[PDB]
Ligand binder design. Structure first.
Ligand SMILES: Nc1nc2ccccc2s1
Length: 118
């Protein structure tokens, strides 16, 4: 019954503020935990720049652009892709950022996305 996509506004966090630097210890766990935190409204987004990924914990969960024409209501369509030891689980478009737990850190912006569930 889950709609295929959900409109979400994610808090954008600076990497040095992030208290919990990843979702888990395996590709399957991080994707599971990321989806659960997205559903609970406890997921943040870190924009990737030089120095960011080495300050976060692998496996990484990225949100990547899933199409070119869909940005309904200002929300870019995205899907989840995990990465561990240079191997990616999924193929998609450009990375919008890396997902991390949000535990109350103050964001610098909010990023509107239309997220593909599964
Ligand atoms: N399987 C599911 N993944 C997600 C991701 C975001 C929101 C809800 C759900 S339910």
């Amino acid at each position: 019954m889950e709609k295929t996509h959900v409109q979400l506004s994610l808090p954008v966090l600076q990497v040095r503020d992030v208290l919990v630097r990843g979702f888990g210890d395996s590709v399957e766990e991080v994707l599971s935990e990321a989806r659960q935190h997205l559903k609970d409204g406890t997921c943040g987004l870190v924009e990737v720049e030089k120095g960011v990924l080495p300050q976060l914990e692998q496996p990484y969960v990225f949100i990547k652009r899933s199409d070119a024409r869909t940005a309904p209501h200002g929300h870019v369509m995205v899907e989840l892709v995990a990465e561990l030891e240079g191997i990616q689980y999924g193929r998609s478009g450009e990375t919008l950022g890396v997902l991390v737990p949000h535990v109350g850190e103050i964001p610098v912006a909010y990023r509107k996305v239309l997220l593909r569930k599964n």
